[PDB]
Amino acid sequence: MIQRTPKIQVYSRHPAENGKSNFLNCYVSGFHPSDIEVDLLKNGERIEKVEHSDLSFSKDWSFYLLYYTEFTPTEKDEYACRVNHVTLSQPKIVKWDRDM
Amino acid sequence: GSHSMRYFSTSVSRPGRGEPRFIAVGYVDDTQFVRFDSDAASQRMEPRAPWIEQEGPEYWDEETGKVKAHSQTDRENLRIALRYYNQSEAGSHTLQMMFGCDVGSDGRFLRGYHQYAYDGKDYIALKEDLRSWTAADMAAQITKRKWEAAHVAEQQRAYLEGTCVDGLRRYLENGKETLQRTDPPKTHMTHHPISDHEATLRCWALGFYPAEITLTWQRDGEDQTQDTELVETRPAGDGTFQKWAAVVVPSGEEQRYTCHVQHEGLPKPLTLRW
Amino acid sequence: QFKDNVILL
């Protein structure tokens, strides 16, 4: 049985505005098996209280999850998403890009 | 418009690290409304949409009973599948299941589904006639004969045409203010200078429901099918969805390009130019 | 409304 590597997107719910409180998202999709680790980082350090959607899957049977947290973007603060999966040789860090 | 109800469930063995995890989820269109997680403390079917909360304690009791029994059935199903395949117990395995129905705008039955995947690959599926099974391999052929001998197809027909369409209809009425909405995309273009002789044009679609949409690039009337980066439709987290399509552009050539956007919330397709 | 069905493989 084959395995599929997560696709990863880190993005904000609403267009980014410094001082405006927002939601930071990390969408992992297209993966098999469902065993996965996902974290959102603030300045290279793991955020606590991060929530996630209930595990669900697409028509090709591959899984997807949304990991999210409330935050206020600022120009100096960097955000990232960390993902680990069987198919990955090392944890994957995808940096938040306001433009993407 | 036409609507759908789906239930998805995943059982995964966690060898050496505990008992199998079961997670089921219920959707009406692109909106989740229920969940059950065997690992959770609650041990109950839980509400996930404002409009399902109105269901009395009887509903929640029955739903819990049905999903718990399905959870335990799928735990034995993993053991059966291991046996069919002569797989090692050291390996971790997944059984996924999907069932539900489609209805038209008048609320009539359009289609029923009841299908399984073992380890992310088709196992057995109810055919559209709701009378027979498509089995993907020799193991599924064994399951198929047991299901033919047990008249299981008839039970699923009766559910998919009955309880499934009745429930979908009730949910659609009770959650009318939310489910019946179609939020058209807020569209815009961005420009990001790469180097001297290049820049990325990116076409955005934001805040749409439902998730289906098309974004397409053109260089002066002609399609640009292979130079476009298109990301997956992603949830904003608030009920709505987002997507973008980008093309790399030679410096001073931004005017040649147009972005095209189709969504059911849009009376007519949008065209965007830089 | 979830199905009312114990079905074994």
**Do B94 and B137 have their domain in common?**
yes
Measure CB to CB from residue B163 to each of C1, C6, C9 and give the nearest one: C1
- For the domain made up of A1-100, give the CATH fold: Immunoglobulin-like (2.60.40)
Asked if C5 lies within 8 A of B167 by C-beta distance, the reply is no
Distance CA B167, CA A16 (A): 40
PDB experimental method? X-ray
Distance CA B74, CA B11 (A): 7
Q: What CATH number is attached to the domain comprising B73?
A: 3.30.500.10
Encoded tokens for B179: 């489910």
Distance CA B49, CA B29 (A): 12
Q: What are phi and psi of B150, to 5 degrees?
A: -100, 0
Tell me the residue type at B269.
Answer: P
Distance CA B206, CA B83 (A): 48
Measure CB to CB from residue B120 to each of A7, A11, A61 and give the nearest one: A61
Q: Do chains B and A touch (3 or more CB pairs under 8 A)?
A: yes
- Residue B73: DSSP 8-state: H
Map out the domains of chain A as residue ranges: 1-100
Q: Please tell me what resolution, in angstroms, this structure has.
A: 2.4
Q: Do chains C and A touch (3 or more CB pairs under 8 A)?
A: no
**Do B254 and B213 have their domain in common?**
yes
**Do B35 and B16 have their domain in common?**
yes
Question: B8 — contact with chain A (CB < 8 Å)?
Answer: yes
**Do B24 and B84 have their domain in common?**
yes
Count other C-beta atoms under 10 Å from residue B230's C-beta.
15
When divided into structural domains, chain B yields a total of 2
Q: What CATH number is attached to the domain comprising B271?
A: 2.60.40.10
Inter-CA distances, B248 with A59, B217, B232, B253, B255, Å: 31, 11, 18, 10, 13
β-pair type (A7-12, B222-223): unpaired
Q: CA of B25, closest CA in chain A: separation in Å?
A: 7
Count other C-beta atoms under 10 Å from residue A38's C-beta.
20
Are the C-beta atoms of residues B199 and B193 closer than 8 Å to each other? yes
**Do B122 and B151 have their domain in common?**
yes
Encoded tokens for B120: 């992310």
Distance CA B222, CA B256 (A): 10
- CA nearest B80: which of A28, A74, A52, C8? C8
Are the C-beta atoms of residues B23 and B9 closer than 8 Å to each other? yes
Domain of B6, in residue numbers: 1-181
- Residue B86: DSSP 8-state: T
Grouping H, G, I as helix, E, B as strand and the rest as coil, residue B60 is helix
DSSP string, B169-203: HHHHHHTHHHHT--B--EEEEEEEE-SSSEEEEEE
